[PDB]
Amino acid sequence: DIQMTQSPSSLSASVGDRVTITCRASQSVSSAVAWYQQKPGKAPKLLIYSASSLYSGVPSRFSGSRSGTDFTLTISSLQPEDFATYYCQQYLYYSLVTFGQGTKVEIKRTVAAPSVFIFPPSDSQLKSGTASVVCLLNNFYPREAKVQWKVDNALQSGNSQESVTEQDSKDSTYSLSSTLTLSKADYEKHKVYACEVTHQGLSSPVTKSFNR
């Protein structure tokens, strides 16, 4: 089972940069290596098919090279339509086909610090028998942000589901939602809840609390 290792995983660049992605094979597959590009909600497309050969219709800014079971894909000057995910494949026999793990490319801008909000549970949901508390992080860059939830001291055992939007089309920033849901009786044990948000563009963590 021949394996493929792809580097890096996330790349941030700007229009006009020079981009290099590396794939590595476990054994020698000669020059039987292909590259594919995929966008969300679509089927993959072929770019290179012999580690150095361009498929018909692909623009010439895509280049591929082979050296000692090390394969390189290069984009000389990035364009706004190249923000997608990229895969490397080895094919040796009909039963010997293996894919890579992918690499996503996105846009670079200046650091912005998140804005933090907290919402208490509604009264109608308490009748049903559940209580859900939601914490919102708005308009931050880069994507790496951390949320810590506590009641009195580091209550992170409780399940807290997080969802992240895609990169915004206007200002290329991010929004994140963290939901913490418990039973009704567990909502009546304590009185204070708080969020603590940390980010790279912030001297000290931001805490937001409410009291029952």
Binding site: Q27, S28, V29, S30, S31, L92, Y93, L96
Partner: peptide, 10 residues
């Protein structure tokens, strides 16, 4: 057989 095939292609 696969090693032999790779060597033959090279």
């Amino acid at each position: 057989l696969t090693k032999m095939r790779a060597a033959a292609l090279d």
